[PDB]
Write a protein that binds this ligand. Structure first.
Ligand SMILES: [Ca+2]
Length: 133
């Protein structure tokens, strides 16, 4: 049923929470598809998850710019390097190999949710003080 679950450990601004939650939803959609061995749907879901992640990263970057966040550069580059990883995964998924599926799911879970979404909390106080929600 579920591979990962958003939790209080990840709480951030309410707009950021909605996008982080929707990313969690995409990961679990991808897991359900890969589990059923429906690889066409799994690739479709992965495509949507990539595009959503890019747009979520871009939402954060716009907030960084708008609010003159001091660590905009570092954070944007961390995003950029992860997109590069996703694009590589996307290519590797073309051949539908169980091993590649797992690399992807574990990378999304281990790095995006369990690491990067926690790291996102670092901009929270700064943006909240300036009235962002
Ligand atoms: Ca093969």
């Amino acid at each position: 049923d579920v591979l990962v679950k958003w939790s209080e450990d990840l709480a951030n601004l309410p707009s950021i929470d909605t996008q982080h939650k929707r990313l969690v939803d995409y990961i679990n959609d991808l897991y359900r598809a890969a589990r059923r061995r429906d690889m066409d749907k799994a690739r479709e879901v992965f495509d949507a998850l990539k595009n959503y992640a890019v747009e979520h990263f871009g939402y954060e970057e716009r907030l960084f710019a708008d609010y003159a966040y001091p660590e905009a550069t570092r954070h944007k580059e961390i995003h950029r390097r992860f997109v590069e990883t996703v694009l590589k995964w996307e290519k590797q998924l073309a051949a539908g190999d169980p091993e590649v599926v797992m690399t992807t799911l574990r990378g999304l879970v281990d790095w995006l949710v369990n690491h990067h979404m926690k790291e996102d909390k670092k901009y929270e106080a700064y943006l909240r003080e300036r009235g962002v929600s």
